[PDB]
Every structure is written in C-alpha cells, then in structure tokens.
C-alpha cells in the first residue's frame, strides 16, 4: 500500500524551445477529500547539486521558478510541462507524492537539448614535469563542446595504435550551447613514455569532415 | 533557509555512519527534517523523516533495524545513522526541510558522499595541464574516495570550465580532470589557478597553471 509513483517517458530530447512533456501516474489517488488539494510535488536536478522544487499542490509554482514550468492534473494523473525548454532546462525531473508516509518518488525523466552538429576543438597535454617524479605519465587530450555525444579516441605512440590503457569521461549537457565535452587519459610507465617521441590524439566525430589529429613530440 | 551536512567521507563494510545537517538561521522551528539517498546514477529514495516538535520520526520501512533520525533542536542540527553497511549503501545522502502536515520538499542540503569499501583514504595530487583560443587545465590524481570539487581562480573563472566524472583507475584510485578554454591573449596577464577540494582527507591545493 506504498503509493507507486511511475513516470513516463524515462527520457525526452527536443529541440530548443520546444514544449517538453513529463507525465506522473500515481498507484493511489493523491487527492485528499477534506482541502481537495493534491500532495504532488516535481522537483529539478542537475548534475552534482540537490534536487530543487519547481511545483506543490500539483500546479502551484514555487517562488522563483519561470512561467514556461507549469504542472497539471488530479487524483492520479499529473504532467509537468515545460512550454519552451531553454538551454538551461537540461536536468532530471522527478514528480513526488506526499499525501502519505513513506513518501515517494518517481523514476526520475532525463530532458535533453536535441541542436544542430558541433564538431569538437581538440587539445592535447604532456604529463608534467611534476607527475614524471613519480614513475607515471598521464598524456590527456580533450574535446571540446561536441554535439551530440557520440566520439571516438584512437591514441597512437609513434603511430602504434594504444589498446587497454586508456580511460574517458564526458560531461553533461551544457546549460548554455547544449554541447557535451569529452576527456580522455593515457597512462604509460615514466619508462614507456621515455622510450617514444610521438604522442597522438586522433578524433573522430560527425561534426568533422575526417578524423583530427593532435600530437607533440616528447621533449 | 540554509541545510549544511558534514562530509563525505569511506566506511568499511559492517560499520556504521553518522551524517549531519546543520539548519542556519538558527532553528527548524516547527518544520520537519527528510533524509533522502541518491545511489550513483539512481532515483531519489526517502529514508525518514523526523518532525522536532512531535519529537517523532518515521522510516521507510527498508531501512527499518538500520536507521536512525535524530534532531537536537538547541543546535538546529538533524543526524541520520545507518548501520551495518554494505556496498548497496554508497550513496549521496541529503538532507531536506518540509512541513509536517505536507511534505514537499523546499529547501536541501548539498548531499554527502558515503562510500562503502574496505579502501583507506588517500589525498590527490594535483598536476597541471599547461597549455586565439586556448586549453589549459589541472589533473587531480590518485585520490580515495570521491569526491573532489574544483573552482577556478577562486570561483571568478566559470565560464568554458568542464570538470569530469572521474574514472577509477586499475589501482583502485580515482582520477579527474578539469579544464577551461580561455583568449589566448590573457595568458600573459592572468594567473590561472585551479582550486582543489578533497574533504575525506582534509586536502586543499590551489595549482598555478603556467604556459
């Protein structure tokens, strides 16, 4: 007798300043009889911070928050809706009901910005001077402000193509161009990165017309 | 209305955690307390709530046998404890104001990171990444557990800044890095120092990225 909440979709990509649409089921009705208010609540969380409330009582606005953010419904049935999604409106979005203990939350819904292709500016860094003491090198190469999301790495040394000794990681969706950005690391023994001269990032990505490469020579 | 929890920190498995969370202003008053998880990449789950006035807490009943709410109204301070940890219970843990009588959840702590592992805490080091744009950085190595946490020159820098997930290295030990793109004209001007924050060891560089 837990109240399910269940959202749908899991995840929606539009293009910018298009109406998102988030919907919320409840296993239970929220409507409590007596005030005919309904306990549901939706929340905004982005990466590395708190969830932040946006709607109470089912289609009141907390303080703050834009007028493109707006929810609906009664009983079980509910829906946010943002009517114009801005850069800035890339999160996950949980409804929640608190009509009774314990209380719930939806699955959350991923909302992304779906934009024109951003071919990547790539760099890439030497380890330093200071990591060399400790007998490892981490060679990174960075690409900047993609769209979308899909890249791929090749490291080379000395035109050798590297395998099992690398690691990447992206960011989330920019808040502001709606690009992601990618890190990639190679780590070599002090010994290894001694032996070889040519360090090389190659990039692939469909915002490029051929793979780009950049590289320095050791020294 | 501010909620300021204590920090992340590892816990063997078996052990037990004690998390709090600080309410400035001086009082919860006549609110209420949630403590809310957040396992990595997952949904939000409500633990238990504690309402000071009604000197009474409730818990999710998962959680029954391992939990424990308490709240010292003298010091505006609420405390979650969990017991015999596992591996499951690695999670960011907030802390989160409401009314008794509703149950919406208005304003929230900043989340603390507890990890379970048998790993022993160790401190980052922190390297540079030296550089009409330009690409400079600092690599923040070797570190357990997360999280760390990076500003720029002391939080003015913000704009073209990305810091990464980090990534578990094959030593067990995490690996991040940060970067920012600026002019490169400013690089004769400007000092570019990349602010490095590892609480679980007491752990703070602030690293001069020279050209």
């Known amino acids: 007798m837990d109240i399910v909440m269940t959202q749908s979709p899991d995840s929606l990509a539009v293009s910018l300043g298009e109406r998102a649409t988030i919907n919320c089921k409840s296993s239970?009705?929220?409507?409590?009889?007596?005030?005919?208010?309904?306990?549901l609540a939706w929340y905004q969380q982005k990466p590395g911070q708190p969830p932040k409330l946006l709607i109470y009582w089912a289609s009141t606005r907390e303080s703050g928050v834009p007028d493109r953010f707006s929810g609906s419904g009664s009983g079980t049935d509910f829906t946010l809706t943002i009517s114009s999604l801005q850069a800035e409106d890339v999160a996950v979005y949980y409804c929640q009901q608190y009509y009774s203990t314990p209380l719930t939350f939806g699955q959350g819904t991923k909302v992304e910005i779906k934009r024109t292709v951003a071919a990547p500016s790539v760099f890439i860094f030497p380890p330093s001077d200071e990591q060399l003491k400790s007998g490892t090198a981490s060679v990174v190469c960075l690409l900047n402000n993609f769209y979308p999301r899909e890249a791929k790495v090749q490291w080379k040394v000395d035109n050798a193509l590297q395998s099992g000794n690398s690691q990447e990681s992206v960011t989330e969706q920019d808040s502001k161009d709606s690009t992601y950005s990618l890190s990639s690391t190679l780590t070599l023994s002090k010994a290894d990165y001694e032996k070889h001269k040519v360090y090389a990032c190659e990039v692939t990505h469909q915002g490029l017309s051929s793979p780009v490469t950049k590289s320095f020579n050791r020294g | 209305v501010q909620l300021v929890q204590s920090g992340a920190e590892v816990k063997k498995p078996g052990s037990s955690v004690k998390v709090s969370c600080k309410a400035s202003?001086?009082?919860?008053?006549?609110?209420?307390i949630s403590w809310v998880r957040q396992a990595p990449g997952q949904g939000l789950e409500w633990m238990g709530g504690i309402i000071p006035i009604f000197g009474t807490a409730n818990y999710a009943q998962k959680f029954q046998g391992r939990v424990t709410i308490t709240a010292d109204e003298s010091t505006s301070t609420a405390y979650m404890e969990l017991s015999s940890l596992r591996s499951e219970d690695t999670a960011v843990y907030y802390c989160?104001?409401?009314?008794?009588?509703?149950?919406?959840?208005?304003?929230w702590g900043q989340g603390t990171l507890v990890t379970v592992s048998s790993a022993s805490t160790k401190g980052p080091s922190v390297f540079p990444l030296a550089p009409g744009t330009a690409a400079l950085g600092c690599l923040v190595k070797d570190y357990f557990p997360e999280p760390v946490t990076v500003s720029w020159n002391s939080g003015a820098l913000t704009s073209g800044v990305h810091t990464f997930p980090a990534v578990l290295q094959s030593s067990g030990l995490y690996s991040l890095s940060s970067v920012v793109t600026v002019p490169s004209s400013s690089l004769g001007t400007q000092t570019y120092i990349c602010n490095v924050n590892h609480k679980p060891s007491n752990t703070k560089v602030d690293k001069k990225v020279e050209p």
């Open positions: 202003g001086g009082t919860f008053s006549s609110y209420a």
């Open positions: 989160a104001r409401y009314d008794g009588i509703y149950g919406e959840l208005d304003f």
């Open positions: 239970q009705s929220v409507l409590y009889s007596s005030n005919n208010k309904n306990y």
